[PDB]
Design a protein around this ligand. Structure first.
Ligand SMILES: Nc1nc2c(ncn2[C@@H]2O[C@H](COP(=O)(O)OP(=O)(O)O)[C@@H](O)[C@H]2O)c(=O)[nH]1
Ligand SMILES: [Mg+2]
Length: 169
């Protein structure tokens, strides 16, 4: 069966680890070592196709590790994550998209913009802002909550759909 290599990137503390653990293990972790970068694997059914997901949950401390460049070169799709209560994390998104495009040496890279923590009442990044950004990038935008599981499957599954279309060119 097809294996899709997904990489989750974003500013520290936006919920990259919580989103992945919720997707893989169906539970909300409220504190996960922020220096730990690992890979998680899950078999899922997306649009009737059985496939395997290999997800890399990046950590900022591990960026200049020997394996980061391998997982970056091997990654087919990227989840660009920000938190809706973190204005700076949203403002940083452009750096991550630029880095991925630079490494892939490609303008068109399968990507999805994710606004995490949508369960929280305090929101400093409005949905209109993220929608405008994703539309200018030509990528989907999905609101998620690792706590309540809202949008978690949709975020990862859409990235898989983005990967499939890129393959069919
Ligand atoms: N309320 C809420 N808190 C979250 C959500 N996602 C992550 N968090 C919390 O935000 C903090 C940082 O999460 P973490 O996964 O370690 O972020 P990371 O540094 O990107 O890996 C942790 O305390 C999480 O419990 C969410 O969807 N809702
Ligand atoms: Mg983490």
């Amino acid at each position: 069966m097809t294996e899709y290599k997904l990489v989750v990137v974003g500013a520290g503390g936006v919920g990259k680890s919580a989103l992945t653990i919720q997707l893989i293990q169906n539970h909300f972790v409220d504190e996960y070592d922020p220096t730990i970068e690992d890979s998680y694997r899950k078999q899922v059914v997306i649009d009737g196709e059985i496939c395997l997901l290999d997800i890399l949950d990046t950590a900022g401390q591990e960026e200049y590790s020997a394996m980061r460049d391998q997982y970056m070169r091997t990654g087919e799709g990227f989840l660009c994550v920000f938190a809706i209560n973190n204005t700076k994390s949203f403002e940083d998104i452009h750096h991550y998209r630029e880095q991925i495009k630079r490494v892939k040496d490609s303008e068109d890279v399968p990507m999805v913009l994710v606004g995490n923590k949508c369960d929280l009442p305090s929101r400093t990044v409005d949905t209109k802002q993220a929608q405008d950004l994703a539309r200018s990038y030509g990528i989907p935008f999905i609101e998620t909550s690792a706590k309540t599981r809202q949008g978690v499957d949709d975020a990862f599954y859409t990235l898989v759909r983005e990967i499939r279309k890129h393959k069919e060119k």
